[PDB]
Write a protein that binds this ligand. Structure first.
Ligand SMILES: *[B@]([O])([C]N1[C]=C(C([O])=O)N=N1)OP([O])([O])=O
Length: 358
């Protein structure tokens, strides 16, 4: 009596559409996948000044959602026997052999527990030589493996090592191995010249057009750009890893395994994981200022839930992202915007929508 696509569109109109007026967001793409059926909704503008509408070809910056691809690459490397997560970075980047950072293992780098790595590198660290010097000069502070501090250089180094173990630069690991194994045709570390017309402007807090800056180990930490249909296919792969060849299948499953907890949030590789059903507050608590910006002592997982859900937020100066999936209900959602909006508004809108869909 109302077809499913219109029902889902109404729910997205009720929950996501009013964020555009509220936060003055020029463009948004929202997608839902349910049982192998894809629903794409597009709003507004990819470029205000060009009058170019958001559409299925629009390329957005994923920000930290990029960490999911880095995690998947690490899982691919591990399950191919190219790395072990108990290895240290000096085994692959030989100039770090026997330095203090070589006491930190790959898993601890992927999951932000070195005990002394902050959200960003210092501004001055830009070149490959400066990055190396930075890690050579690094010294411990907190006990290794016990304190989570969410960190671009931590998972950046992880990404770098993964690339070294596969004998390819990190951009090539994604663009030539991992994106094609996931079936993504419109995802990039470096958007090529012939695709730049599809690359949206981001918009800052004064609605001024901006794009992400080049940075040290930017690609593995926050450097991937993709379209809505590609992101939906990524969510499809996470929902149905058993439909992919062994190597990328094991890779995807590797990203799902929780390693530790901070209260109700289980840190997997890239993904944050929760006991399902999850309350809205549990999901909101995961991205509190205290969790995101400060050190938190981790605990051993002492209740492993049978059924989980998984999410990740991403932001660049000019773009917001949120991806969530619930294997049990065979359903997932992607939101891409070309202006940041509060993490709380993303998580809540997707919660309402996903819980309402018949
Ligand atoms: B990632 O995109 C990393 N990130 C966020 C910021 C910021 O707030 O400026 N800098 N780096 O996003 P997140 O915090 O995991 O959603």
């Amino acid at each position: 009596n109302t077809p499913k696509d219109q029902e889902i569109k109404k729910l997205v109109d009720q929950n996501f559409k009013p964020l555009l007026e509220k936060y003055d967001v020029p463009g948004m793409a929202v997608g839902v996948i349910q049982n192998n059926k894809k629903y794409e909704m597009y709003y507004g503008l990819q470029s205000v000044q060009d009058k170019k509408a958001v559409n299925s070809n629009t390329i957005f910056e994923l920000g930290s959602v990029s960490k999911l691809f880095t995690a998947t690459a690490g899982g691919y490397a591990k399950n191919k026997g190219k790395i072990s997560f108990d290895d240290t970075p000096g085994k692959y980047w030989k100039e770090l052999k026997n330095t203090p950072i070589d006491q930190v293992n790959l898993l601890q780098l992927a999951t932000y527990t070195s005990g002394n790595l902050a959200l960003q590198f210092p501004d001055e660290v830009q070149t490959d030589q400066q990055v190396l010097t930075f890690f050579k000069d690094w010294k411990p502070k907190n006990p290794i493996g016990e304190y989570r501090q969410y960190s671009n250089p931590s998972i950046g180094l992880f990404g770098k090592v993964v690339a070294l173990s596969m004998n390819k630069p990190f951009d090539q690991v994604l663009e030539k191995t991992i994106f094609p194994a996931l079936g993504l045709k419109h995802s990039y570390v470096n958007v090529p010249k012939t695709q730049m017309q599809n690359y949206a402007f981001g918009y800052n807090q004064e609605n001024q057009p901006i794009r992400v800056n080049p940075g040290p180990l930017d690609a593995p930490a926050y450097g991937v750009k993709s379209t809505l249909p590609d992101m939906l296919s990524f969510i499809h792969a996470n929902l149905n890893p058993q439909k992919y060849p062994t190597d990328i299948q094991r890779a995807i499953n590797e990203t799902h395994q929780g390693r530790y907890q901070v209260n109700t949030m289980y840190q997997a590789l890239g993904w944050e994981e929760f006991s399902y059903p999850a309350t809205l507050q549990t999901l909101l608590d995961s991205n509190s200022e205290q969790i995101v910006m400060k050190p938190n002592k981790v605990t051993a997982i002492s209740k492993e839930p049978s059924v989980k859900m998984y999410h990740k937020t991403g932001s660049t100066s000019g773009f917001g992202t949120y991806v969530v999936f619930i294997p049990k209900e065979n359903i997932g959602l992607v939101m891409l915007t070309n202006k940041r909006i509060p993490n709380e508004e993303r998580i809540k809108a997707a919660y309402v929508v996903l819980n309402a869909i018949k």
